[PDB]
Amino acid sequence: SDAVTIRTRKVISNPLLARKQFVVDVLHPNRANVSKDELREKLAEVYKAEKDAVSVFGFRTQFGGGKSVGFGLVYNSVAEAKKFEPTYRLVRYGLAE
Amino acid sequence: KTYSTPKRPYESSRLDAELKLAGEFGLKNKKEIYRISFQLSKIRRAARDLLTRDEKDPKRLFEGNALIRRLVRVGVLSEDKKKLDYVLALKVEDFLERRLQTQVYKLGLAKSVHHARVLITQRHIAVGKQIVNIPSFMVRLDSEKHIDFAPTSPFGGARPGRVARRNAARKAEASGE
RNA sequence: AUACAGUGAAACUGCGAAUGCUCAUUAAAUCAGUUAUCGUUUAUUUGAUAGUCAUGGUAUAACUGUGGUAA
RNA sequence: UUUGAUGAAUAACUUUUCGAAUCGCAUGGCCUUGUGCUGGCGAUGGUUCAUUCAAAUUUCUGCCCUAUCAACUUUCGAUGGUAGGAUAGUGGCCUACCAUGGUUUCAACGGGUAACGGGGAAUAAGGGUUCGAUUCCGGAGAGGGAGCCUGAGAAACGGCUACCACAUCCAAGGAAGGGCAGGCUUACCCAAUCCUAAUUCAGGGAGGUAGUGACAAUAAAUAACGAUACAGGGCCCAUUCGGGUCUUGUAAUUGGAAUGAGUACAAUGUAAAUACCUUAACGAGGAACAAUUGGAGGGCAAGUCUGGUGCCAG
């Protein structure tokens, strides 16, 4: 029923640090602001990636519903994910203490 | 300011005129009438000074074109009446027509102007995509063909409201007990 | 690990600590612009750069202990 | 005569400065197997010069009113020379030795300037008539005159002497310290940016977030729709007769439908957090989920009071 839609708009890539970049809108009619952890796993299969390496953040929902503005990433290695992320995001993802 | 008190605010003519306007358009204030008439005064003053500026002056040329076309995009002016004496000829009732609650009543989604007032503030009418709920929206042309019920409104959409569902469950309990 | 190498308080030493509020009014002064420094200084930055005793002596702080004085 | 080439240390002097008695890793090669020689790739310092960040003076270009301002400078050298000290360095910056000058109606000089001033300094006014936002104000102070101290850079004033003025603590011997907010609130974090250190981290009441704080000036809600009953009267203008007009009137009954104020799990949030945006679940029938403020006017008693030529007037 629910078109689980987060448009990962602003699509670009950075293979120096090996991570991929994209903004967030959240189009999700009759759904209340899907959470970043199930988004993490869903991004993990769509990018054939790691449950840590997925990393999106900062979501604000537009009027009229089924629209939210946020700002998202994905690493492309476990070491890059575990070292280059700031620790506040590491605890937001529950990987640090 | 955003409302200006008319300079003889209590007069036989003023007073009965506002009575007719608020009664017929379902307003609730002299303040609402005043807001419309103040901004009309600014527009029409601009047009008059433009008429003082002589024929074929570049300023008159370009800005008159601008003012006419933006008033027809707002919709109070009509397509084949493109002249500055007509922007002089406008009056308050034309904008008060273009309000939203008058427009819901005129299209026919409600019965009386007060019904349309209660609908829009009740969050059922949805211009375009959003649920608008301010009864002075000043709808344009494109939207004035696009006014209709919101898709989650139980008049043109989803499941009935809370009084209906408590009542249906109440007769369900009536049959159960 | 029979010298130590982990870790580490006290201290030596290196560098920073020269990027705080209140009170008084100047018309080539200030300020803005533009020079000059074949007339000066520079911790720092970077760049070059010196053929002209199988290892010399110290000392402290800390620690130990004994004390003074209302402090 | 051209086409092309070359240039245009000595003598000493001195507190010696020096030419590393310092951290990370090669393991080989040779035989003298000594553990001998030899060696390579990374840090901290040091000699000088360049360069960088700065700084100092300095050329010249530009800012108001006023002659009801005609004088000014040698009365700290005023102008200049020469010599020396001083300074990182020139230069009357300072001293000797001198010369006797310079500025001036092209108004020097002087006076006032509200000089919270001005600078296209500053982003501008994505169309306010000239208006916003930023930046430089300029200097001085950090009880008060005076003097000294390090560092590349301080005349540091949250070092030291003495002085003067304060004001403390005590066992009376002594000892030691420095205004700022308020009137007539001082809660979280270095997360966005930047900075600083032997520098990923440490830190930065820089920088940020939040909370008390109707003012002026905004957008809504406090109800929408329908059925039935019962009644014959309503309403507008005229100074008195009067006249004009017509679906109306009532604390009368009654039906379902709408929801937002609220109430309340989460998610989204940020260093973290509040609120927010979203979001399930509740949640409107009158004494409710109980709006004010102002104006005009009646009527009532076995009631009170006063004046009258009954029963009336005030």
10 Å CB burial of residue B53 (0-12, 13-18, 19+) is middle
Strand-pair category, A19-27 with A5-7: antiparallel
Q: What size, in residues, is chain A?
A: 97
Whole-number Å distance between alpha carbons of B17 and B15: 5
**Residue B136 beta carbon within 7 A of nucleic strand D:** yes
**Residue B99 beta carbon within 7 A of nucleic strand D:** no
Please name the helix (run of DSSP H) or strand (run of DSSP E) that holds residue B60, with its range, or none: helix B58-74
Nearest CA in chain A to B123: A64
Place of tokens 């696009």: B146
**Residue A32 beta carbon within 7 A of nucleic strand D:** yes
> Where do the structural domains in chain A lie, given as residue ranges?
5-97
* The two structure tokens encoding residue B136: 């002075």
> Where do the structural domains in chain B lie, given as residue ranges?
9-177
How is chain A split among helix, strand and coil, in percent rounded to 5? 25, 30, 45
C-beta neighbour count of B15 within 10 angstroms: 11
10 Å CB burial of residue B108 (0-12, 13-18, 19+) is exposed
Q: What approach was used to elucidate this structure?
A: cryo-EM
In chain B, the N- to C-terminal Cα span, in Å, equals 63
* The two structure tokens encoding residue B123: 């969050």
For residues A68 and A61, the answer to whether their CB atoms sit within 8 Å is yes
> A5-97: what fold?
Alpha-Beta Plaits (3.30.70)
CA dihedral B73, B76, B82, B87 (to 10 degrees): -120
**CB contact B130 to A (< 8 Å):** yes
For residues B125 and B137, the answer to whether their CB atoms sit within 8 Å is no
* The two structure tokens encoding residue B96: 């008060």
Distance A10 CA to D93 C1' (A): 68
Whole-number Å distance between alpha carbons of A93 and A78: 14
Resolution in A: 3.9
